[PDB]
Design a binder for this molecule. Structure first.
Ligand SMILES: C[S@@+](CC[C@H](N)C(=O)[O-])C[C@H]1O[C@@H](n2cnc3c(N)ncnc32)[C@H](O)[C@@H]1O
Ligand SMILES: [Zn+2]
Lengths: 218, 308, 106, 395, 129, 75
């Protein structure tokens, strides 16, 4: 029975010291997972491609391939704002989801268009009311002009994954292409890689997280 | 109907978490706090000592019956060779890891944590491969199919049943809504998920005793099994469920063990209940693991049994 | 029926014209039959690559007419189109906004 | 599966478009060969080292011959077995070594010759066909007990027909195609011969359905024919379909390859200096459609995998192995059951209702499997798994 | 069970290693006969170490101008021919890395015995209790 | 009844068809609405390519279904 005590003390002490060394965290509490443990605590203690020339050349080649195919036909045109930077969506701090730049981008450059379904104002009011009804409570509406709004709650681009921040690094302008107004997002100041794309909502609580910041999105 | 054989399990000691048959229908790997019992089938037992610092939640065999992985709340996961001792220590998580599984080839291992994420580890080189953070809740179960090895389902304590890929780890389809896209009090945590034998339909159990079969191509439920009284449907632990495709079986069966020592059998095609077992009533059945025509059941105690 | 030589290659720039210019510009005694095609392809590639940036500039400036200032911007803002045109001066192109850092107030 | 769920726009591209990974081999690579399915990559290194990488990790999984019997000098051919178990290789060490991948420590069988080897090819049974350096006849080695038998300049490349495994094709060092009928065990009479060029044939590839054939001459051209066989393996003819070449700088070709079944695409690797790219033509019309532009060095060998749909090619100066694969981007549209993403502002039409507020028994088969995927690759084929060796893991 | 498992280690140490070292050592005299005949030009080819025959009476004169291509003790080469690589040069290297692989698994497999024993000591520590 | 045909380019067309129509009739309908010859297209539904000879009802297609139209593009 010597083995019991000997290997017990040796392995136990070594393993707890190894865990202590591997534990750069605060040694949070927790039992096993056969105990019905939900631990639904509010605050979590754990964490939380080539060039532009290649892209434009490939895009023009694809578009001229379409135009060469067009001799058989309309139903094939493309959203002209294809000059968009590479981004991605992942878990964020300011909110659950967010948009991170995949490559370092300069300043005063187009990033992405905010696209969705076009609706009038009363339709937008009805829709936001119904969304507040079903517990959505997360407005994705955008104001093109006085009598037209974009709605990206169910249909739209990844531009619906850009959070409001008290200090933005991207702004939103309203271009008119083909005679119609569209919402583009420009890089206000230079943006490094793997940086979250901040942007000011101007809505007229705030999980801002900025150094200088105000407690309201409004 | 399925007859009983023998309750060989050792009901003495700490509580056991699960017991998964070997992929050749020959061994039974049972767990106790910081140790592994191995029962032959033959009537004999062997023991393996681990290198954890806490009791571990789940263990699963290897498709060649030569290794055993274990998921300990010390935030690490240990793969131990059944004959040459411990082999690899995956130490990248930052939260108690819950479930584990690897693919048909034993080429990559899948780990679910409380970090609100999943991790794809490389078994042979012991290094990490990928990380999939697609939950704001407790990721309690991951499972790759056996005939396929390209997709993996993921269930959490918020109802989100996601499907990802083993090759690149992107989100392919989500069959349910989280708190933000449904009435908040409509949520129901997912306990245990399981693929069909052909990876075309998804078996799932929630924390209200319901057992659903989703058509993952259409994303719609097609079959729902339930106990018409709601006594133990409402549950609190990972009350085991599993599938039983009998050798030359007409239609495979679904098996579940509620917070009693009860075990049910439903014909998936007809939903008509066929048989139930109890105790053979003493404690919540913590796990069930089936095989070609056999089944091992383990209650919250050391209570262990098998059938045929 | 006839079939323009610049349409058999998917080009817009003229190939018969480029071929006549190569022939009657006294560059060599003989001109290969595929040299004008290659040269016209390269010419239209370069002009499209600069017109695209010029249009991007004229759009990001809320106009809808490419204008010499937009070509100057499209060139001097690039990095390789700037070496190809390092010696030229684009009439009515102005200059690029730039102020040194020793001069900006503190 | 993982493809049925994917959208059939970015998954049904016709060929790779970008390079993703670049394996680095410590030795210099000389031959590439996927497993019958896109599972393993059997590389033959510079000094007879033979590794088997796995496509899920890109890191080695088994080095055959670690105990003994390994190869010592540049390897020249690696042929898998249709199941996945056996693996034939041949090097410049004159030896042909067949390995049972269930015991990869030592070679299962091996034979030795009197000259370096160009290539070995499988037939089932167990019998390979080999082409020896400088010789003018192929060799049939039906080595279940190690016997060897024999069967216009020389013979460089051999290949067996896909639909009719009795037919055999061979190219000469003087421009002759010669066909053979394996109507027996070790006695084979020709059925057709001809001479299409005045230079050496260097490659003989054939589509999976015997409805096409390609040839790489020492002349800087590629001759593509539409072969057909009939008459109890006697009727055989060739019809010139196309000739490909480099119109700008007349470069030479290093290796060629087809698509999967109908061979709607032809992939070739150029050989001259300043040549770093792969060409991809059609075969019906023959017009250039793509140029793979990833590497920075002369590319020797090519291999296509239709399950994962990836092109693999080994560099010459360095020795690396570049991979061009189809890339599918992550769609946020999946994050919910009804999240349909658009590209342009869609208009909205509304019914008069919207302003005014206010058993199942479907067929279910769980034990039946699916035979073909979206692309059209045959599942359910036996996919033998290389057994992991634990001895080299403890250290 | 285990003595069967890693007594092949002793097999792998002794038997195949002595056979392969003897086959490697034969190439010394098989090279020496051709070397002494060649030094008295044509590249002495391979194919003469099989049983290491070198079937010859007087190699300095049996190679003599009368017959050039080794009618007896037949080497592949007739002259300075690049047909073969004349593997007689550096042939040992094959066997050399052969026995190098021998020794490599030897050291590895000895380490494996120690690991098995490290586990089985704890085995009888658990079986005593 | 209406079915949908989603083109890669971002366009979805809402064809009107009957379940008793053949797929050949569907390709003809896509042509006569959009002018694309039936030979140059390629229709996909639920991961399976719709086979040239069979019928719409063979695939259990009902109204307001969506399906993908990819082009067998060429030079
Ligand atoms: C464009 S959506 C942002 C996307 C969101 N993270 C998601 O997961 O879909 C904007 C909405 O997210 C929430 N949100 C965004 N930024 C926020 C912030 N800084 N503080 C609080 N809520 C925020 C609000 O409900 C707001 O109406
Ligand atoms: Zn704020």
């Amino acid at each position: 029975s010597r083995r019991k005590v000997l290997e017990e003390e040796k392995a136990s002490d070594w393993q707890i010291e190894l865990n202590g060394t591997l534990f750069d965290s605060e040694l949070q509490p927790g039992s096993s997972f056969k105990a019905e443990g939900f631990r639904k605590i509010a605050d979590k203690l754990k964490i939380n491609v080539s060039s532009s020339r290649d892209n434009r050349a490939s895009n023009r080649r694809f578009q001229q391939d379409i135009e060469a195919q067009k001799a058989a036909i309309l139903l094939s045109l493309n959203q002209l704002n294809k000059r968009k930077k590479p981004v991605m969506f992942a878990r964020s701090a300011i909110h659950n989801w967010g948009l991170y730049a995949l490559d370092s981008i300069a300043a005063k450059e187009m990033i992405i268009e905010y696209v969705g379904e076009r609706i009038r104002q009363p339709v937008a009011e009805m829709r936001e009311k119904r969304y507040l009804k079903n517990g959505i409570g997360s407005s994705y509406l955008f104001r093109v002009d006085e009598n037209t709004v974009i709605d990206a709650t169910k249909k739209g681009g990844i531009a619906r994954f850009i959070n409001h921040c008290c200090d933005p690094n991207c702004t939103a302008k309203i271009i008119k292409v083909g005679g119609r107004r569209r919402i583009v997002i420009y890089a206000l100041r230079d943006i490094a890689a793997s940086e979250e794309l901040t942007y000011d909502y101007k809505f007229e609580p705030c999980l801002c997280g900025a150094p200088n910041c105000k407690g309201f999105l409004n | 109907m399925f007859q009983f054989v023998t309750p060989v399990g050792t009901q003495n000691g700490l509580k056991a978490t699960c017991a998964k048959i070997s992929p050749d229908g020959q061994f039974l790997a049972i767990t106790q706090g910081l140790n592994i019992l191995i029962y032959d089938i033959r009537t004999v037992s062997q023991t393996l000592v681990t290198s954890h610092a806490r009791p571990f939640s789940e263990l699963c065999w290897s498709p060649d019956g030569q290794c055993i992985a274990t998921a300990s709340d010390d935030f690490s996961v240990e793969i131990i060779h059944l004959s040459y001792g411990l082999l690899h220590t995956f130490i990248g998580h930052t939260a108690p890891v819950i479930s584990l599984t690897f693919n048909r080839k034993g080429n990559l291992l899948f780990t679910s944590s409380m970090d609100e994420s999943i991790k794809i580890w490389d078994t042979l080189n012991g290094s990490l491969m990928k990380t999939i953070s697609a939950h704001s809740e407790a990721v309690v179960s991951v499972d790759v199919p056996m005939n396929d090895s390209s997709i993996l389902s993921s269930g959490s304590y918020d109802g989100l049943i996601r499907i990802f890929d083993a090759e690149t780890g992107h989100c392919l389809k989500t069959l349910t809504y989280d708190k933000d896209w449904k009435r908040e009090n409509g949520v129901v945590p997912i306990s245990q998920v399981k693929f069909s034998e052909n990876a075309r339909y998804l078996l799932v159990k929630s924390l209200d005793g319901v057992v659903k079969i989703w058509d993952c191509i259409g994303g719609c439920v097609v079959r729902t099994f339930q106990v018409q009284p709601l006594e133990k449907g409402v549950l609190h632990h990972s009350c085991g469920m599993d599938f039983l495709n009998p050798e030359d079986g007409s239609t495979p069966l679904v098996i579940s063990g509620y917070e009693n020592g009860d075990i049910y059998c439903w014909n998936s095609d007809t939903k008509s209940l066929l048989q139930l077992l109890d105790g053979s009533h003493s404690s919540p059945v913590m796990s069930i693991h089936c095989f070609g025509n056999i089944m091992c059941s383990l209650a919250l105690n050391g209570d262990c049994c098998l059938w045929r | 029926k006839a079939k323009t030589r610049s349409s058999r290659a998917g080009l817009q720039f003229p190939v018969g014209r480029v071929h006549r210019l190569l022939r009657k510009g006294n560059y060599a005694e003989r001109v290969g039959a595929g040299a004008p095609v290659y040269l016209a392809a390269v010419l239209e590639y370069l002009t499209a690559e600069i017109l695209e940036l010029a249009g991007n500039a004229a759009r990001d400036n809320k106009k809808t007419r490419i204008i010499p200032r937009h070509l100057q911007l499209a060139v001097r803002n690039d990095e390789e189109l700037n070496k190809l045109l390092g010696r030229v001066t684009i009439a009515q192109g102005g200059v690029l906004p730039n102020i040194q850092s020793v001069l900006l107030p503190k | 599966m993982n493809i049925l769920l994917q959208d059939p726009f970015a998954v049904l591209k016709e060929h790779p478009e970008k390079l993703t990974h670049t394996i680095e081999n410590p030795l210099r690579t000389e031959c590439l060969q996927f497993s019958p399915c896109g599972d393993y990559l059997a590389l033959g290194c510079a000094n007879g080292a033979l590794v088997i990488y796995d496509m899920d990790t890109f890191r080695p999984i088994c080095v055959p011959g670690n105990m003994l019997g390994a190869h010592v000098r540049p390897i020249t051919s690696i042929a898998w077995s249709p199941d996945g178990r056996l693996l034939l290789t041949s090097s410049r060490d004159w030896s042909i070594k067949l390995w049972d991948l269930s015991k990869p420590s030592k070679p299962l069988k091996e034979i030795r010759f009197d000259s370096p080897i160009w290539g070995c090819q499988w037939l089932d049974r167990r019998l390979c066909v080999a082409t020896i350096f400088e010789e003018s006849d192929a060799y049939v080695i039906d080595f279940s007990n190690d016997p060897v038998a024999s069967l216009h300049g020389y013979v460089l490349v051999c290949t067996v027909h896909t639909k009719h495994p009795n037919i055999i094709i061979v190219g000469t060092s003087k421009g002759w195609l010669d066909f053979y009928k394996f109507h027996s065990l070790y006695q084979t009479e020709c059925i057709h011969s001809l001479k299409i060029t005045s230079s050496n044939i260097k490659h003989l590839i054939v589509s999976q359905n015997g409805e096409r054939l390609a040839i790489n001459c020492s002349d800087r051209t590629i001759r593509q024919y539409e072969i057909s066989i009939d008459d109890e393996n006697s009727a055989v003819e060739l019809t010139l379909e196309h000739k490909y070449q480099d119109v700008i700088n007349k470069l030479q070709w290093n290796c060629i390859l087809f698509s999967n079944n109908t061979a709607e695409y032809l992939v070739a690797s150029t050989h001259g200096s300043s040549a770093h790219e792969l060409y991809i033509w059609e075969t019906t019309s023959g017009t250039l459609v793509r140029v793979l532009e990833g590497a920075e060095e002369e590319l020797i060998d090519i291999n296509w995998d239709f399950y994962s749909m990836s092109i693999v090619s080994n560099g010459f100066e360095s020795g690396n192995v570049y991979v061009w694969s189809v890339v599918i981007p992550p769609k946020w549209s999946a994050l919910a059951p009804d999240f349909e993403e658009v590209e342009e502002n869609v208009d909205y039409l509304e019914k008069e209702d919207e302003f005014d507020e206010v058993e199942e028994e479907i067929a279910i088969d769980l034990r039946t499997r699916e035979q073909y995927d979206v692309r059209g690759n045959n599942l359910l084929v036996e996919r033998f798994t290389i057994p992991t060796d634990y001895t080299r893991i403890i250290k | 069970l285990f003595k069967k498992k890693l007594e092949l280690l002793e097999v792998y140490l002794g038997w195949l290693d002595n056979v392969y070292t003897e086959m490697r050592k034969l190439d010394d005299d098989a090279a020496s006969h051709v070397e002494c005949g060649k030094e008295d030009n044509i590249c002495g080819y391979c194919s003469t170490y099989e049983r290491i025959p070198c079937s010859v009476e007087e190699f300095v004169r049996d190679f003599g101008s009368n017959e050039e291509a080794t009618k007896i003790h037949e080497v592949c080469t007739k002259w300075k021919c690049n047909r073969h690589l004349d593997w007689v040069s550096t042939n040992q290297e094959q066997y050399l890395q052969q026995i190098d692989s021998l020794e490599s698994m030897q050291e590895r497999l000895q380490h494996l015995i120690q690991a098995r024993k490290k586990q089985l000591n704890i085995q009888y520590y658990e079986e005593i209790l | 009844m209406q079915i949908f045909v989603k083109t890669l380019t971002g366009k979805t067309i809402t064809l009107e068809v009957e379940p008793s129509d053949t797929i050949e009739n569907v390709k003809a309908k896509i042509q006569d609405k959009e002018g694309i010859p039936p030979d140059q297209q390629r229709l996909i539904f639920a991961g399976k390519q719709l086979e040239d000879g069979r019928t719409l009802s063979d695939y259990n297609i009902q109204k307001e279904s969506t399906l993908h139209l990819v082009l067998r593009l060429r030079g």
